[PDB]
C-alpha cells in the first residue's frame, strides 16, 4: 500500500480520484438541475433541500446579506466532501502495483490543501497569537477530516483482509454503516466550520 506516483512531482492515483469525484459531483449536479420546475419533485427538491440547508447554516453563523455570496461555494463544498468521503468505502481496489484508487480524503496532502484553500478564500474575502491560531485552525481542520476518514479506511481494509484470508460480515457491516455516518458528519462539520471562519472574518 505504497504511494504510487507515475510522476515524481505528484501522486497519480490522488489525481485520478480527484477527477472521478469532480465528474461524479458535476453529473449529479446537472442531473438534479436538468430543467426548471416551480413544483419541486424527484431530485430537484433534493438539490433545493441541500441548497436551503447550506443557507440555513449560513443564517446560523452570519447575517443573510453578508453570507449570501458563499452559498454556491458552500453547497459544492459539502457535496464534494460528501462524495469524496463515500468513494473510499465500496471498491478500494488493490492492483499488483503499490496502491490505486482508495479515496481522495485519505490522502493527507489533499485534505490539507483543501483546508488551506478554504482559509485562503476566507482571507481573500476578508498579533502573533492570532496568526498561530490561524495556522492552528487550518491544520486541525485538515487533520480532522484526514484522520476521521483514514482510520475508517484502514479499518475497513483490515476487515476486508480478515474476511478474505480465512463469518465476519456483520462487524464490517456495522462499521461501514458507521463509516457512511462518519462521512456525512465530517462533510457537515467541515462545511459548517468553513462557514464559521467565513463569518468570523467577514463580520
Amino acid at each position: 500500500p505504497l504511494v504510487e506516483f507515475l510522476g515524481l512531482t505528484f501522486n497519480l492515483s490522488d489525481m485520478l480520484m480527484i477527477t472521478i469525484t469532480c465528474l461524479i459531483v458535476f453529473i449529479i449536479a446537472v442531473a438534479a438541475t436538468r430543467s426548471l420546475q416551480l413544483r419541486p419533485t424527484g431530485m430537484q427538491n433534493f438539490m433545493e433541500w441541500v441548497f436551503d440547508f447550506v443557507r440555513g447554516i449560513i443564517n446560523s453563523t452570519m447575517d443573510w446579506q453578508t453570507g449570501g455570496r458563499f452559498l454556491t461555494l458552500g453547497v459544492t463544498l459539502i457535496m464534494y466532501v460528501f462524495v469524496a468521503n463515500m468513494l473510499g468505502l465500496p471498491f478500494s481496489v488493490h492492483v499488483n502495483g503499490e496502491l490505486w484508487w482508495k479515496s481522495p480524503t485519505a490522502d493527507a496532502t489533499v485534505t490539507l490543501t483543501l483546508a488551506v484553500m478554504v482559509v485562503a478564500l476566507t482571507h481573500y474575502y476578508g498579533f502573533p497569537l492570532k496568526i498561530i491560531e490561524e495556522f492552528a485552525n487550518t491544520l486541525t481542520l485538515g487533520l480532522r477530516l484526514f484522520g476521521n476518514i483514514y482510520a475508517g479506511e484502514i479499518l475497513l481494509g483490515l476487515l476486508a483482509s480478515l474476511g478474505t484470508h480465512y463469518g465476519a460480515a456483520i462487524p464490517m457491516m456495522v462499521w461501514q454503516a458507521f463509516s457512511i455516518f462518519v462521512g456525512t458528519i465530517q462533510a457537515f462539520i467541515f462545511t459548517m466550520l468553513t462557514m464559521v471562519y467565513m463569518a468570523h472574518k467577514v463580520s
Binding site: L143, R144, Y150, A151, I189
Partner: protein, 71 residues
Amino acid sequence: SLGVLAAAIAVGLGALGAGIGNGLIVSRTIEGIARQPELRPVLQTTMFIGVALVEALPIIGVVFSFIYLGR
C-alpha cells in the same frame, strides 16, 4: 520494537480523551432533551457537531500513531 507501544499509548490516550469528551457532551445533550422534548432535533444536531469536534483531535493521534508504527 518501541514504536509498537508508542502507537499503542497514542491510540489509547486518544480513545480515553475522546471517550471522556463524548461522554460529557452526549450526557448533557440527553439531560437537556430530558428538560424539554421540543428541542431534541437541534440538540441532536449540535450533539453530532460536538461529537465530531471532540473525536477529531484524538483521531489525528490515531493516524499519527500509525505513522509512529511506520517508523
